[PDB]
Design an enzyme around this catalytic site. Structure first.
Site, mmCIF file in Angstrom:
data_model
loop_
_atom_site.group_PDB
_atom_site.id
_atom_site.type_symbol
_atom_site.label_atom_id
_atom_site.label_comp_id
_atom_site.label_asym_id
_atom_site.label_seq_id
_atom_site.Cartn_x
_atom_site.Cartn_y
_atom_site.Cartn_z
ATOM 1 C CG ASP A 1 6.430 -19.129 3.345
ATOM 2 O OD1 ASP A 1 6.024 -18.191 4.063
ATOM 3 O OD2 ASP A 1 7.158 -18.956 2.348
ATOM 4 N NE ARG B 1 3.663 -11.333 5.604
ATOM 5 C CZ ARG B 1 3.640 -10.021 5.389
ATOM 6 N NH1 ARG B 1 2.540 -9.318 5.624
ATOM 7 N NH2 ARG B 1 4.726 -9.410 4.937
ATOM 8 C CD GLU C 1 7.891 -11.866 4.847
ATOM 9 O OE1 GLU C 1 8.553 -12.570 4.052
ATOM 10 O OE2 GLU C 1 6.883 -11.217 4.497
#
Ligand SMILES: OC[C@H]1O[C@@](CO)(OC[C@H]2O[C@](O)(CO)[C@@H](O)[C@@H]2O)[C@@H](O)[C@@H]1O
Ligand SMILES: OC[C@@]12OC[C@H]3O[C@@](CO)(OC[C@@H](O1)[C@@H](O)[C@@H]2O)[C@@H](O)[C@@H]3O
Length: 480
Positions: free
Chosen positions: A14, A145, A196
């Site tokens: 990421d 998250r 996400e």
């Protein structure tokens, strides 16, 4: 990779919202020593969005305390109290190594973002994880998250969006330290899955109107949609996000453009944003790739792209993509080939592995038209980009490499009007990737492709009729 960012060594994951300091973009990204192993944040800077200078770890992995994704912002007004111009970052970490305790930790830097100090206590605590008990509660607490920070200029406060299971959570704060819970964002088609690496930002459209955008990395493979970046235009009033349309739009239709992040361009922060993504997919990211054996590293980021918001008839808005302008500075040679009519197949008199090729294809009765890149002379390997039915597809199947096969994720497709009998393609080819920008950039398909050393050819093909291939220009790319 000739012109795509790769980590010096190890596992890349990421990317994190770049911050601009010292007249450059400071890019952070998840990095581990072992593929899909625990790790933290690494640092790389770029002044043009093409070439990257790696600086190592800034937010290290610690015993049973890895650093997951988040985001970083420049506290110009010193709202957080760490000094004006300080770089502040929030990131999710599993407290006590407990997954259901994943919460937001704050890190800060006072040197433009080259070294960070950790704030021992999390600024946003996962209270669901402490009160959870049933299987559902646990699952819910285990998805809290990737905080994305944004300065809501209109309200003079900070707003942060956090990804959760099939929904997004919002928090506001005046100092990046004390956060207040807001109203969640819910969407009706959970088969779209996700949330996400959410993104939240403001951008001015080509008509001058200001708009909010909420986006995230998704997984809609089940219902025939991408596993990339979906976004909802709308507005944030300080309490909740109002989507103009609950059915999200897509930024990429390829296989590998995950955990993407956007950030304001240095030259036109209000109208032009830059974006980069991790070129991988979790359907297979956890494995060794050719570069592991050859150069001891796994993973590369996509090309950096420019984004602009364009008004559409009916008052709605959409995003348009195009490769970052500066890539033009890395062109070492420009080759133009004569227009030609093809009925069947034809191999172009050109060979290479790192380049951008543009062309126009026009036809009538042909039921299939396209171009093959990374074509091996033995005729067995090649990736096909073309138009069929209502699809502008990119089929990497014939490029599957023994020991590293990407099957069955071969044929990617972006929607294109069935009535289209002409199309413009802009294709970026590198040693481990293929990125297709269709027409005006409304649709893009990004995919990693394990090209063999000899996969350097380019061919043209049509099924059921002739096609006219024109404006063929190939721009070789190196480093410079
Ligand atoms: O389980 C998710 C689902 O539950 C709802 C109920 O309306 O919200 C749950 C969720 O909201 C918070 O208060 C804020 O994030 C959490 O603590 C709580 O788990 C829906 O919004 C959501 O779809
Ligand atoms: O869906 C388009 C596709 O499949 C159709 C067809 O065309 C052939 C022959 O040219 O392959 C080329 C591309 O056409 C393929 O990669 C696309 O998926 C043929 O092999 C295939 O059956």
């Amino acid at each position: 990779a000739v012109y795509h960012m790769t980590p010096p060594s190890g596992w890349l994951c990421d990317p994190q919202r770049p911050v601009t300091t010292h007249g450059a973009y400071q890019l952070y990204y998840l990095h581990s020593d072992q593929n899909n192993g625990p790790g933290g944040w690494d640092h790389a800077s770029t002044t043009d969005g093409v070439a990257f200078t790696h600086h190592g770890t800034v937010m290290p992995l610690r015993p049973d305390f890895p650093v997951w994704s988040g985001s970083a912002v420049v506290d110009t007004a010193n709202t957080a109290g760490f000094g004006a111009g300080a770089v502040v970052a929030l990131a999710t970490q599993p407290t006590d190594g407990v997954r259901k305790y994943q919460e937001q930790y704050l890190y800060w830097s006072t040197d433009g973002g080259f070294t960070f100090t950790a704030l021992p206590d999390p600024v946003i605590v996962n209270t669901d994880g402490r009160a959870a008990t049933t299987p559902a509660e646990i699952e819910n607490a285990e998805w809290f998250r990737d905080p994305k920070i944004h300065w809501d200029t209109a309200r003079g406060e900070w707003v942060c969006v956090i990804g959760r299971l099939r929904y997004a959570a919002f928090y506001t704060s005046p100092n990046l330290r004390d956060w207040t819970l807001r109203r969640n964002f819910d969407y009706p088609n959970h088969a779209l899955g996700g949330i996400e690496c959410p993104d939240l930002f403001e951008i001015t459209a080509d008509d001058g109107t200001r708009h909010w955008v909420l986006a995230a990395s998704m997984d809609a493979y089940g219902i025939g949609l991408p596993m990339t970046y979906a976004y909802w235009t709308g507005t944030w009033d300080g309490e909740q996000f109002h989507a103009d349309d609950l059915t999200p739009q897509w930024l990429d239709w390829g296989w590998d453009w995950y955990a993407a992040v956007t950030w304001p361009s240095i030259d036109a922060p209000e109208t032009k944003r830059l974006a980069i993504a991790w070129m991988n997919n979790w359907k297979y990211a956890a494995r060794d790739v050719p570069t592991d054996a050859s150069d001891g590293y796994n993973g590369q980021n996509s090309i950096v792209r420019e984004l602009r918001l364009a008004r559409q008839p009916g008052g709605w808005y959409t995003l348009l993509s195009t490769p970052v302008a500066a890539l033009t500075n890395y062109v070492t040679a420009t080759t133009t080939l004569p227009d030609r009519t093809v009925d069947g197949s034809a191999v172009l008199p050109w060979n290479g592995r790192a380049y951008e090729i543009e062309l126009d294809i026009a036809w009538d009765t042909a039921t299939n038209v396209g171009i093959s890149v990374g074509r091996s002379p033995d005729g067995t390997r090649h990736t096909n980009i073309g138009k069929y039915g209502a699809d502008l597809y990119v089929d990497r199947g014939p490029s599957d490499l023994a020991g590293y096969s990407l099957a069955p994720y071969s044929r990617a497709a972006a929607p294109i009007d069935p009535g289209a009998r002409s199309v413009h393609l802009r294709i970026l080819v590198d040693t481990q990737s293929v990125e297709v920008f269709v027409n005006a950039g409304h649709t893009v398909l990004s995919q990693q492709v394990h090209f063999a050393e000899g996969d350097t050819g380019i061919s043209l093909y049509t099924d059921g009729g002739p096609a006219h291939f024109t404006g063929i220009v190939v721009r070789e790319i190196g480093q410079a």
